[PDB]
Every structure is written in C-alpha cells, then in structure tokens.
Amino acid sequence: TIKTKNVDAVFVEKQKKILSFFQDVSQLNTDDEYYKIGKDYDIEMNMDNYTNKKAVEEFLKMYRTGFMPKNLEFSVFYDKMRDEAIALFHLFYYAKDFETFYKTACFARVHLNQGQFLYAFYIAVIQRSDCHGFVVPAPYEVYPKMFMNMEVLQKIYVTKMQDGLINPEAAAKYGIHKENDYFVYKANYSNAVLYNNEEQRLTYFTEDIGMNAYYYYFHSHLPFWWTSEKYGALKERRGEVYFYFYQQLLARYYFERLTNGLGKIPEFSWYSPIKTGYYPLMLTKFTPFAQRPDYYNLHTEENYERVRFLDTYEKTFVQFLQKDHFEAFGQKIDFHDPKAINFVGNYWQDNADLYGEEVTKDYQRSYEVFARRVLGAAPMPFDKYTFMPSAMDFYQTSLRDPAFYQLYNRIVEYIVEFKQYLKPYTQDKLYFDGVKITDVKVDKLTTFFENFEFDASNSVYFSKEEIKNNHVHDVKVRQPRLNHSPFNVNIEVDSNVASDAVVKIFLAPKYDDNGIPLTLEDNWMKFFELDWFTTKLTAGQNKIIRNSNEFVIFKEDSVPMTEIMKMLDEGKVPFDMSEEFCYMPKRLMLPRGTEGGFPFQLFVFVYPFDNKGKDLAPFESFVLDNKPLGFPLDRPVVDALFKVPNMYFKDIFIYHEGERFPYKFNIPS
Amino acid sequence: EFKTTPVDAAFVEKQKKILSLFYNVNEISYEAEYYKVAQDFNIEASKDCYTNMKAYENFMMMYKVGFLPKNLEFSIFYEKMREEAIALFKLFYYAKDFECFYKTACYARVYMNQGMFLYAYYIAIIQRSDTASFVLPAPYEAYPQYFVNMEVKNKMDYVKMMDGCLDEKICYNYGIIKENEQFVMYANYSNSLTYPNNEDRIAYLTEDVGLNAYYYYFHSHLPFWWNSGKYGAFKERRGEIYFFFYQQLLARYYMERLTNGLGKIPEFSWYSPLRTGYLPPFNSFYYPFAQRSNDYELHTEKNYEEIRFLDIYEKTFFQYLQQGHFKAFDKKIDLHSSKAVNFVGNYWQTNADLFEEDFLQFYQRSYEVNARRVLGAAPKPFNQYTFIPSALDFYQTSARDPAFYQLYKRIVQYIIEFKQYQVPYTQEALHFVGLKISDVKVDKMVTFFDHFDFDAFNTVYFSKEELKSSPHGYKVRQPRLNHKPFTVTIDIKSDVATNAVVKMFLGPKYDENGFPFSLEDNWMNFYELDWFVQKVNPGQSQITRSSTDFAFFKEDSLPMAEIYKLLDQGKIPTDMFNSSDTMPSRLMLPKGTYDGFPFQLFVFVYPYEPTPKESEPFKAVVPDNKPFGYPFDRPVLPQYFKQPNMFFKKVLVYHEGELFPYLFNIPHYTPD
Ligand SMILES: *[C@@H]1O[C@H](CO)[C@@H](O[C@@H]2O[C@H](CO)[C@@H](O[C@@H]3O[C@H](CO[C@H]4O[C@H](CO[C@H]5O[C@H](CO)[C@@H](O)[C@H](O)[C@@H]5O)[C@@H](O)[C@H](O)[C@@H]4O)[C@@H](O)[C@H](O[C@H]4O[C@H](CO)[C@@H](O)[C@H](O)[C@@H]4O)[C@@H]3O)[C@H](O)[C@H]2NC(C)=O)[C@H](O)[C@H]1NC(C)=O
Q1: CA dihedral B248, B254, B258, B261 (to 10 degrees)
Q2: Hemocyanin middle domain: which residues (chain A) (predicted)?
Q3: Architecture per CATH, B189-421
C-alpha cells in the first residue's frame, strides 16, 4: 500500500552508500569504511577525477584558509558559510563519476561541519545526473531538532541519559512509551503550551513536518545562488516558477486562515512596528532561537542600514513599474511582454540568472536574505560563524514564523503589480469550440487528524558501544497530522468533434470575510491548482472520473530510512520519494474543514491539447504546455470576458471529522 | 450691463436641446422629449452615427456587460469607472453631427449613471468643435449636492416633503422664504465643526461656488486622461499651463490667508501626522463623506503601498534633476530647453501626453490620484463601483479641503526646484528700450459681501405630476465675496511708436512677520490680473484700464431660468460661452480690511510680437511668444527688476459693510 518500484544489484549498493550518510549524522563510526576512506582521502592527488579543474583548486584554497568548525550551526544566508557550501557543492557536482563522488563525501563527512555537509550533499544528490532517480530521506529524519519543540527534545535527552525509563508508568503520563525496542514520544504543537496571539490557531499547518519538509526540498531542487543552466528551457521561465511556488503556497495558507476565522495576511512597513510576535520553542546545540516580541520596531538602531537597503530594493521595483520599458542588469525589459515575469521573479530573488552567472557573489545583496534577517529580530552576528538563529535562517524552519508569510505575501503582491500590465484573456483565447462542461459532482470532502511517526534518532548521541552494535535507531516522535478521505471528481463534458483536451482543477474560496461571493476580478490569485491531466473527447457526451489519490501535484508520505533498508533487500524503492519528493504532501491538500462544512469552490477548465510545443520535463514534469503557470489564472480577469462554456464553477463544502484539536490525541490515562 | 451676444434661430433650437438634459438630472420624466428619443434610439443598429468604428464597438463591448448603475457616486479617479466615462465621451465626441450627439446623450441621460452622464456630457460639449460655442449651466446648478452644505440640502428636502411652509413666520426664522412663488434658503459657510481649526477663517473662499466651479471647468477644458492633439501647437506647452494654473491659484489662496492672518501654506510628510483636518459636510447615497481628523497619521497599514509609490514618484524627479540629462519615456530629457518645461508638467500630472498616447491607459498609475486617496482619509472601496467618497474624489469639491492646497503646493515646490535649472532673464530680455512707466494710479480697491442666488432644484425630488413641467424654484442664497469696479492709470514716457503688451499682477507686500518681501522670494506669489495690447506713440501719454475689462476674470454665470429668458430674445451671455474656464471676478481681490490691507501691483510693459491665430483650450493662452506668467514664470535676479518699463505700486485693499458673512443671514437683522 506504498507505491513501489523495482531495482537492480548496482542500484542497491549505491543507494546504501548514499543512505549511510544520513544516519548518526552528528557522530563518526571509526569502524565504518566511509571513515577509513574519508580520513586519508587526498584531494590534490585526485585532481584528474573532476570535470572542473578550477573548482578543485578553489576548494583547495578555501580548505587551507579554514572551513567553518564542527558542531557550530550552519545557515546559507551568511556569506562565508555559503561560500564554503558552494565550493563543497561544486566538488561533489564535478566529480567524474560515482566512486569519486562517494569518496569526496567520505572525506567531507569526516572533516567538515555537519550541517554544511548535509546541505551540500543533499543538493548534490538531487543535481547529479547519474544520481537522478535515487532516493533521499525526509528532511525531518535528517534534521530532527528543527522539526520539533524543546519539550519533546528534552524528554528524548532525559531518556537517553537514563538509558531508559526509571518509571514506565510515570513516563507514560508524559507521553513516553517503549514499543518493542523503540522509544515513542508524543508531541503537541506549540499552541498546547503557548497561545500568545491568534496566529497560534494555525500551528497544525505552519508547524506541520511535511509542509516544512516541502519548502526545504523546494530550495534544494534549485537553490537561489545557482544558475539553472542545467535545467535548459526552465532557465527562461525561472522567475515564473519562483512567483508560482510562492503564489500557490500563500493561497494554501490563506485557506487555512479562512477556516480558523482569520482573513487577510497583514501588510507591514520597514519603518513601523510589526504586530504579531514569534516565540520559537526550538533549541540549537549552542543557543535558543531568537524571539520577536509583539509590536517589534523593525526600524531600531541596529537596522538602519539594513532598512535603507531593503527600502531601496523595493523602491527600485516601484521605479520599474512606473517606467514600463527600461534597461536594467544588461537587459532591455518590457513590462507589456508577459515573458517579463522571468526578470520580475529573478529580481525579487536575486538569483544567479538575474546576472546571467553560474553562482551568486557576496556584493550582490539579496533582498530575501536581509529581509529575513531583520524580521528574524536576532542580535548582530558575533562573527562570520557565530549568529543567533531565528526560524527564518533555515528553510526547514521558515514556515513556522507568521512574519515569513507577510514577507512573501508582500513580494507576491509586487509581482501582481507587474501583472496588471498584461492584457486580460479574451473570449477567443479561452473558448473551446463545441465543448461544454454540463455537470460536476464531488464526493464528500472531509478532513481529519491522524497520528504519524518519524525516526528522530539523529537528534541523539550514541555511545561508542551503540555505534558499533549499530543500535542507532530507537527514537520515534508520534504526532497528529492533517489528512483527508480520498474523493472523486465527476465531470460531464459535451463536444461535437472528438479531440485531445487538457483538464485543470483549481480550489478557491467561496466568500470573503463579509460573506460576499468572490469575483474573479479581485481574487484570481487566491485559486489553488489541484490537478491537471489530459483526456480524449469523443463526439457526444463524456464522463470523466478523477480521484484525489491520482492528482499529479501531490505526493505520498515518505517512508522512514529503516523501512527503505528493508525494501532494498527486496529490490524495491518508494516511488514518490524518487521522482515526486518535492511535491506537496497529499494529506495536506485540503484546509481543515469545519464540522458544518466550510464553503469553497472547485474550478474546472477544459481546453484543447494542441500538440507538445513548449514542454517542461527537466526541472518539473509539471508544464508539458505552452501555457503560463496557473493558466488561465496567471493574470487579471474580467468576469464577463472570461466565463466560457468549457468552464465550470462548483460550490463545495469541506467537512471535518473526529477530534477537532490535535492535542486531544496526546492525552494520557 | 451684463455682456450680451446676439444669436440666430437655428441656434436657439440646438441650445434648447442641450440645456434640456440638465433638467431634473436625478430622475426620469417619461414624457420628456429626451425619453422618447432614447426609446426610439436603436444603439446596435447605429454604427453609422459614428466617425470612429473602434469607439462604437468598444462601447458595445462594455455596454453588453453593463455600466455603473444609477444613483452610485461617480469619480474618474477610480479606474473601472474612468474606462467607462472615456467610452461614453468617445461616443459623444465622434458623433457625425448634432442629431447624432443628441440621440446618444438622451440615451445616456436615460440609461446611465447621472454622474457619469454629466461628466462626459459637459466635456463633450466643450470639446466637439460644432458645440464649442454653446452655453452650459453653471456646474453648481448641474450638481448642487456638491455645492450645498448638508444643513441647507436638508432644509430643502424638508420643505419638499411638507409640500411648502407650515407657516411663514416659523419658516423665516429658519432662513426659509418665498419670493415670486419660489423657495429661497439662506446659507452660511460652515463653522468650526467642519474646519476644526484656523482654516475656518477662510471658509468663505474655499467653499465659494464660483471658485469650486472654476476648478471643474479647468479640468473639463483639457482632462488629464486625454491627449491635447486637438489643440495643435499648444500640445508642446501643456505642462507649462499645468504649472501656471496651480502656481496662480496658490498665489491667490496665500493672499487670502495673509488677510486673515494665517501665514504660509503648511508642508507635510507622508511619514508624519498631517495637522489640518477637515470634515466634509456631504453624503452620497450610502456614505457620509470620509472625515480626516486633526493630526491624522498618513502612514498607516492601509496606505503603506500607496506611500511607497508616492515616495518613489517624487524621488525619481530628484534623480532626474541630479543628473541633468536622463532617458525619460522615449527621448533624452535636457533640462536647459523648454521641451523640459513641457515634460515637467506632464510628469507631475501623469497626463496622456507624458506617454504620447491618445488616452490614459488602464495600468498607468497617477501621482495625483494616489495622493488624493491618501489625503482623502476614506476607507478602501467596497467594490469597483462603490467607493467611500471624500472631497478630493471630485473637482467640484476639491478646493474645499485644506489638504488640496497643501498637495499642489508640494508639486509646485518640486517644479520650482527644476526651475532652478532655467537661465534667468537678463537686463536685455526685459528692458524695453525707449519707454518708461512714470507712474501708476489706482481708484480705491474695495471688497464687500453681497447675496448670490442659484437654483438647487436638481437636488430636490418631484412626483410624476410635477416632472411633466420641468419643476425648479429651490434657490440657495449666500453671501459671496465681491469688489467694486476700479481703474488703473498708467503714465508713460516713450521714444517709439509700437504695439506693446501691458501686464498687471497682484502680489504680497509684507510677509506674516512685517518685513518687505524680496522678489527672489516672492515671484511665485504674484497672480495675473490682466493682459492687453496697446498702440503706443512717442511723448507722454497714458493708458486707462478698468477692472471690468481685466482679461482673466468673468461675470457670474446666469442661472438657466435666465438663459431661457435670454434665448427667447435671440441673446446669449458672452462670458458663459467665450470664457467659462476663467476665475469669477468677484474673487479678483482678497478680502480687505477696514483700514486697507497692503499688497502690491506689478505693472509691466513690453514690445508686442505678432503671433499667429490659434484656438487654444483656455483663456490663459494669450497670443504671445512669451512663457505663461512671464516675467514671473521663473526665478528672479532682483537687480534686473528696476527696468524703466516696470513699476511696483503699493496699494491697499479696503473692505466695506460687514466683515463677516454670517451677519447677512440673521433673521431679524439687516447689515452694514
Ligand atoms: C572561551 O572563549 C574564547 C574566546 O572566544 C575561546 O578561545 C578561542 O578558542 C579557539 C579554540 O576553540 C581558538 O582557535 C584555535 O586557535 C589556534 C591558534 O590560533 C591562531 O593560530 C593559528 C595557527 O597558526 C599559528 O602558526 C604559528 C605557530 O607556529 C604562529 O606563527 C602563528 O602565530 C599562529 O598562531 C592561525 O591559523 C590562526 O589565524 C590563529 O590566529 C589554532 O591552532 C586552532 O586551529 C585549529 O582548529 C580549527 C577549528 O576550526 C581548524 O580549522 C584548524 O585546522 C586547526 O586545527 C584553533 O582554531 C581561538 O584562538 C580562541 N580565540 C581567542 C581570541 O583566543 C575558547 O575556545 C572558549 N572556551 C570555551 C571552553 O568555550
């Protein structure tokens, strides 16, 4: 009941070497051969084993100067740390073949900082062509400390320090149980100990382990600091991809807001206090994460120069808008051209493609970075390697901070400003000659919470003894997560001539906060894409059934590594972990319903699938179409020029079943 | 002694048609001609009423969707709305001929939002070259709800519901009387409750109906959203007149402030609380107009995005100046030419000429629109057809708000920063060789308040019965500023025999302190009284000029009742057709003081250069090479202003009768 895939001899060996690097991540097994290789591995001597002579040499210059020390906390948002990560990445990426790649990782495991290494290695496995189709573990199994509050962490430490339970019945009262040879820890979301404002209503979504894993994967698939030359025709669509990822996410987030009675993400000002604080319960081996109190003055002394930069970055965009056509960064740009999204997105991201370069440079200040830093409310870094981490210093923690959504909402709104320059689609562009959707029905939509466990053993240090006996996997975290029942969408379509067609499904809200029905005019960016697929219509009447379990845009829960070691002994590999790893998890498709049925709408659009003109398959198997991302809702709409027979809006209601509140799953006795 | 123009019988017929659409604009009479004509006007089948096929089809596209519903507020400052009014105007403006225009308007008068209809209709009448000479009602007779304070509007609605006066005596005590079987309502200017500060001293100017109407006419004579290609060579001077119009108006306003002891127009920041609040005494179908308190914080959550936009809109200008020569909207801008002058004004107004297109496009954001939105204090619109109005949402009410003068002051300062790059006039460009002004004499300059009536019937409702005879007779009576006639006498030694230009301005003599203004700091504070050409001959001679002849001022518009009386005699009022966009002359002088408030009169005589024959948009474009406002169009070197052909003359402006307008509207009391 987990989507499998079969696998040969050479594959399993490599995959085992790859997975070796994600276990006991913060320690070293002296007896493991990865260590014997690693200790003595000579990079200079091996120079002929890399595609890029200057990458080896650049790495070597940095490595003698000195890399970040071990145990210190790694973040890519800081110059020196990132530069070392990139130098390391290149070395992984330009290794002639697997053997060389493997050995280089061995050395790097042994000699360099843990976070820096996993960061670079993870990315490398995703980017190397010979590695395509291999599997990596879930971010939460690799970095467990970042996916869980203190309370849990500390129970784990205590149990480990005691080598078990002094009182099993007392431990039980704290949600700690022995299940055969596992220690299982129940975990509440933070609102169960902290309700310091209404945003805490959303913790089952913002603290969700999958959602946060999802953002991490997105970063890794194409990090901002690197070109996208490797992905070919997506290079000319990179900005579009950046807008759409964020647009989709904020729609999804917004949906969660609506169902907990919260409305719009609030606007903010670099020159004013920001309302909602963030009080993180994460610990770092060396420090606590930094808090932002409520009404925090973003314009305090330490931030003056920072705010001057950020304000100018924005103002420079506002200038672009005002002048329509202009030259910036070596490019004549026209805001009338829909292709300009590429520039717009690239600018807001300060990625390598903005400059037409392979890697970004220190003097090219990113807006995202400094915005993250200021809103993170940290004191000034002590030095190049010693900073006070906030949620927004890591891709694995960002979604936890309401301020993150404020920051990307603002960015998305500026891109929407650019999108106002595009002419709206006319009838002719949308009309599907002789095709009409006559009905849509939907099975009941119910959400519900359900326990989920993940391997949390990397959070813990084992003894020399335990590392040798390989007893390194006995810590699991149990947590209630959002889920929903599978559902069919029944679509009835009429057409004169048989034809190849594209079907698209979107989710959007039905009402604003006041209970007025949504116009497309104001609300086209609040539509969330559920699925696209192709069918063949016949003359007459058509019945199209599509199940939620088969929506192209979502993945299944990933499998724990231990379960993957099991499968590799059988020649099996978890399919969704191989090629669908960076999709949103299925269980989070729907926002949490209400007991009464919260009102939403399904938008179904059917259009002709002409041929395979402009065709994305290098980055994402997403857009085998000539069409903008989120077509037909990638620009302003006029309600009356828009609605055509091959469109259907269906009113639907999202229900919720069982326990309403995650914490009711975590009570003892 | 009200200027007449004779007019033939074909004219009477067309003028009567046009005037008839202004009767009871707020309701529909099923037996008005316009209603029959609209019933009979098949619009789908009328492609051949229009010179421009695109306009027609563009209108039908929007038409089939639908328009702004009747009864809602209309403002061109909201985009969806603007795109519709513009479609309506294109229809009006490209109608083959008069028949075609009339059917179109009747149709619009019936089936369209009354605000939108009146806006497009006014503009089209001013713009169509076959209608150029027809007369329009004063805008306060077409939109009285924009010119009457709530108090008065309510009293009228009350009198209507009662079908008249319970008893005379009760009514008279409330400022309500009958004269010739019409109702007259005495109206005060508003008090400390709508102008909760010193700006209330000046309410008789800022609420003046002439002065508000003037701003409306100014806009309608060349609207921002339209290019100016209709006006030929004037196109290359559009931005110039924009500065001039606002520089003159603020100069007029600062002089009022000085007589009422109020000092400089205040400056402000988008990042700070704005001092002078204003609570507009108006309401729309759904909403009381938005109120702005004293010390209102401009910088709040709701305006952040707008403020960012405004901020970079201004700082870009700084960047242009800093650089001298820069790429801007197609060409290189060189600051030392006058293609620069034109650019500067078009930039600040974001008008259609800035982009060199025919009409303002849907996505081009305006500085002035967003400024008015921030300063208007209103909540954000409920939907695209429903906004919450503020005084700044309309040219009819704009001059009522202190913030309006503050905003344009700021734009005018910015332009004056650019004007620092302009080369000053030399001795030889201003010296009129062979001619000297030896002296200037002026009759007593006297202001006073006197009553002024207009029919406000368009803001009153009428039964199906009463409508059958175009009912009216609901007059508002108000004390309004005025002055007596006066003659300026100019004495001159001359060697030469040429035609000459005589210009006259009024400006301040002392600042709020008590110190003489110096020209370098005061040139922007002069407004033009007059311009004319004169044959001069050698020796001593003297030119006489009566205030009744000043070029830049008009007589009060007649009410429609009077327009019709005159029509039946083949007569047309000159000032209403030859010069509507001109300041009423009653406001020619600031209110004086009983002892005489000191101002100065600049009299300037220079040689006349025969400049061709045009037909420009305003009365302010005189047939002269010279910049608008010349020689005070640009920064001054004071040592060059002791020219024999210039003369600064100190004059006092007196006031007579009651010093305060309320003293005219007290029941058992009569003034002076
Ligand atoms: C309490 O607080 C203090 C203050 O912050 C902490 O003190 C710091 O501790 C760290 C140790 O954790 C120290 O770093 C070490 O410094 C050593 C020497 O530093 C200098 O010398 C390096 C070596 O070069 C020398 O060569 C010749 C000798 O023949 C001389 O001519 C020359 O002067 C040099 O000194 C230089 O390269 C360097 O620039 C320094 O100026 C280092 O030997 C040592 O390096 C090792 O460790 C690195 C770990 O990342 C690794 O990269 C290297 O490969 C190498 O093996 C090490 O970094 C700081 O010096 C010290 N700071 C201060 C200001 O004194 C203290 O740790 C903390 N205590 C607790 C309990 O928390």
Answers
A1: 160
A2: 138-414
A3: Orthogonal Bundle (1.10)
